[PDB]
Symmetry: D2
Subunit: 388 residues, 4 copies
């Protein structure tokens, strides 16, 4: 419970300042540093390597809690664990024995950059990275970037995906700072340009094309996608809960009745809260079960495609329900608050819809629906990829 | 749990064979009720020491949903047997449990149900007995019931009028008349018609607590206040079972019989219908499993706080709301994935799923379960314990 | 006014008996004869030819009124005008000069029997065709004075696979109406099969030339109006069922629903009636506008593909809204009426859902939606066919 | 009527060029308000004899929807000018109309609105003194006249009576506070107005104090004011909906990436456009019918309670459907456009949702629904008020 208490207190502090911060956009350095000081970036690192030795259920609940307060910080925090998951699933034990204590002592907050961007092999096993990555979540103030590139000028085969974990201030890396979005405004998800960037052999995650081989095999590293899509699910549930709580506080404190004596006794106000709160309870309860299954497979040495596909179907279902819920709720709750909630821009409630509306487009929910339908009707698991 | 769920799965399989003809006939599914007796599953919650299976609520709930997916009437009868058993177990004395539970095992009891302005009154008789009079309008599973769980309000009672008496009595006790007047849209084999009590004697050793004890237990939040969330989650599992049964039956039809408007199973909109409803079902089923585990956890406590009972009732009400909306939409809209021929032949019988769900979801109005969840979230008021919340 | 009063009085009588009649299925002969005596089957025949000289707006309103009382009779009545429309659009003036006065005198009620088609037309030396095969879903095929029949040419030196259409007596030698209709709803539409055993169709019964209907579809010319006309007939069946269900539910709520004050003052009951009645008003008002456009183009000597395509989009839109409305309200109105409305099978309210659920599947609303979307987004009109 | 609608269409075209930049700043769209002044359209309902255009309500409503599709704030200002004009026309004396209406033509009047906090106290010779602050005052900046409402106080002829007046906005003691800073509808200048000892003369009063209350409760002709005005709101919502749909479709055609060879051929993109375009077509066709009925009753000398009640039910129905439509469409169309539509804030598509989400809260749709349900179930027409 201690880690969840730390996340709850962080979220409490973030609520105080989110309204002003997200209007500005840009990098929430102070808040990222507060997360660094909290230790929670080490949740999944073993105690033996200096981390907290915690589980995915705890990580997911902390993501949802932080997201309920500040969706951009929730996303940054959550995608740090997506990046960490990728490293853990592909790095060697020797790499992790060095990286994880270093991540603990240096308080690493991981960012993401990932085809245009090429990896040219050099004779000593190094690579040179060139090109621009269009969207690069958490690419500012990042202690390391998880970078993906495709091999080029490669006598052993072009187009093979390489991944590496590299310093963000390595020569040739330019974080362009061009993120100016509807919502998720403080996730620094703009472009990063690589000009002759060197990647050393001991920074590489697996071999070229290994991620593609793991996807095609449905093996354990292909857990990365359900893990990450469930991170997104918890962002949407967190935003949903935060919006519901903020609306209810407004209804209790500011809404006027319309033969109604109190707005909090209005039958239609109560119906809106009841319908959305009910769907939220069921979605949150279902999501906890899936998070436990993530942890179970995370601990296995081997994962079959049937185990991975069943999990991906469960995650996709959770994401579909959470997507529909957060998008409806963040818009319709105005009907429970009244005109003054929109007449005063400064109240800032539209942040919840803007944040959810932006992030839920990451990959199309229509095709998560098709994937669940193709499984249920035709017994076909989703084809593993970076989105399914 | 594995053995009991296998037994329930095999029961459900047999029920699917005949449900089309039986539910059209209505009436009492006597043969299937006896099959349930033979299975031993009616004793799931009776301890092994008393002759039962010593199983848990999560097992009961999964078995309810599995049977309901095959035959909603038998799923309801089976599920409400456990609501009746829960009430008995929450109020019965050690002496009553020592007598009744071995007898329930040996006689294979299948429990049925008959319950200020109440029509059924209990008037005191000498020696601690009560006389029951009146007609109970809706009495779930009241036919072929080995014992009836009966409720009445005290009248002409020196110890206080208006108190709720509950008793467990033989259905063949003199003066009990099961009227057999159930003829419904769906849930057609649940025998949920009226029962008329004419001078029916109830003895002290049949009383479930003292008169009014249920009202005290519910107002105090003592352990019997778990009865309503337990029972409302039974209904939730009937709805999720019907939902799953309908989705699986439609999918088989789409695979084997639908024509494309290359193959219907590759149609983008057919796939979207199955994906939308299967996704909601997965989430609802996963949520329902968690709440079932909480039911068992609190069932095992000596004392449940009002906060714990209130939070459970909110979770159960939420599950029931989502399951109600899902089953009502899914059982109607899946025709759009199957095509016109699924309705052109009445005998296909797919409308049974909608009729069953549409009937049972009206048991108590979802609008007021929604208001209860809203009053909790907005105003921090837990629902007031009653027979419905 | 006069025709609509006649239809309203017909519907009143049908409501008295529909609950008992529809349970039995089979042919509602007495009600079909009442429609014959009413004169309304001649609504669109000019006064010159002995008909009423009325307009499609009147026909559509009459269809919806009858459907609100008895969906099977509404369908039978409405599809009579679909059959009539086909005849009017493809028959010669000489054919109509004979047929229409005959249809008036003899009180014709028209029925319907019709790639990989099961029913072939083999040419005979005189210009007749021999029809063979079994046609499924032959709406209104029983007690029909004439059948509109479609067949595909076979063993035809002038081209196989061409569609021929004809209007023939239902007792023509070799025609067997099979009576094999036992459906969820629309139970008295006699939509079973018709078997053609060496049925001779004579040259004066043929509608156009072989394949002319296909060429008219490909041209988007005036005869291709048949589809929007017919799809708007279906739309009015759905609106009529919706109105009938709403009024029947309201009668139950006023006389039978129990409260817990008064059920008719319950805020959630009122919300259900309000939401559906509002959508019904808007859908009905919109359908009247489309019906006026049907009449306008029906009176033109020539119709462009643009006029036809725009009409079909408007019809499809009306059908989409009406389909969603009727399917939702015929199920959800139980939530307003309460448990006793389902506990008493004899109330029979499920007839509305059964009728709507059956008929709305005639062709998939998902593709009507796609057709409207393809027009709005890509400016493509639907490809004319028997369904679009 | 083509000329006036052509003028409105050209105005709307010009507004679309600049709305994205203008609405960001908020404040008063003076240049565009003056463009509307020069157009003559503010005189649509003034007779030609008095220098107006002698046009009808259907033209007004079509113009409102067209302008709203380009700029929701200008559509609202324009529409509410006609609500204000309708109120004046329904209560003004023959003397007042003879003077005001030629003056409104000559001086190109754009009418604003201010309406308890605001009292009217008797002054000598039949004048009143207005004191208090009006909370929301639609179009209160750059207004040639304000329609002002107050409640009599210290009045020997009766306290608590509603007085209305049409006064200059620069009358001594009128302070337009300029405090409108809203989520959407950002250029409607709907902030507060403070009245300090403001004199209102008898020839500025719109009927006697309390007359509006009698006129509404009796169902005399001024009881048309509310359905007229609620239908103006309905056309704002339909205009926003059409504008959003057309803007999204332009983006989908030119910018959306396929997930599928072209986004415009994606089955789920097409389904989104088809669902919303279908509902929009039906709602717009329905709204034309109700607008015609407004005109018909506007021309009547006496309107019965059943005629007014039926009209209000039809208007409330249209508003309910338009409200649900625009709120869903302006959010869900992002799912047809893709992530880049939200990633680039400058696209500015969220303006449609912000505008619609703000204005649809003017009065609660739940009680419009209840009013329609109370009519349909209980045969009770809505009680006339400023909202029903």
């Amino acid at each position: 419970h201690r880690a969840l208490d730390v996340a709850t207190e962080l979220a409490k502090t973030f609520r105080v300042t989110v309204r002003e911060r997200e209007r500005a956009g840009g990098t929430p350095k102070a808040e990222r540093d507060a997360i660094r000081r909290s230790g929670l970036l080490t949740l999944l690192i073993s105690k033996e390597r200096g981390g907290l030795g915690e589980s995915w259920p705890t990580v997911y609940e902390a993501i949802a809690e932080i997201a309920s307060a500040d969706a951009s910080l929730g996303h940054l925090f959550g995608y740090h664990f997506s990046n960490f998951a990728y490293v853990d699933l592909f790095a060697s034990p020797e790499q992790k024995a060095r990286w994880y204590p270093q991540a603990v002592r240096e308080r690493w907050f991981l960012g993401n950059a990932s085809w245009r961007v090429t990896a040219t092999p050099l004779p000593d096993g190094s690579y040179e990275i060139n090109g621009t990555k269009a969207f690069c979540s958490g690419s500012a103030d990042a202690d390391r970037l998880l970078v993906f590139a495709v091999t080029s000028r490669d006598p052993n085969g072009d187009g093979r995906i390489v991944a590496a974990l590299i310093p963000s201030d390595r020569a040739g890396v330019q974080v362009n700072g061009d993120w100016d979005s509807l919502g998720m405004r403080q996730t620094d998800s703009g472009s990063v340009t690589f000009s002759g960037v060197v990647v050393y052999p001991d920074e590489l995650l697996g071999t070229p094309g290994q991620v593609t081989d793991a996807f095609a095999s449905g093996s354990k590293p292909s857990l990365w996608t359900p893990i990450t899509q469930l991170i997104f699910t918890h962002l949407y549930l967190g935003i949903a809960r935060g919006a519901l709580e903020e609306a209810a506080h407004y209804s209790r404190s500011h809404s006027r009745p319309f033969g109604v004596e109190k707005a909090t006794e209005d039958p239609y106000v109560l119906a809106i809260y009841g319908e959305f709160a009910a769907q939220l309870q069921v979605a949150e309860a279902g999501a906890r079960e899936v998070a436990l299954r993530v942890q179970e497979l995370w601990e296995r040495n081997h994962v079959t495609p049937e185990q991975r596909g069943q999990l991906m179907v469960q995650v996709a279902s959770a994401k579909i329900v959470a997507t529909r819920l957060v998008i409806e709720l963040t818009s319709r709750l105005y009907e429970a608050m009244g005109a003054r909630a929109a007449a005063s821009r400064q109240f800032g409630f539209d942040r919840f819809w803007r944040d959810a509306r932006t992030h839920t487009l990451h990959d199309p929910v229509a095709y998560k629906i098709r994937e669940v339908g193709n499984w249920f009707l035709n017994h076909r698991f989703p084809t593993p990829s970076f989105y399914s």
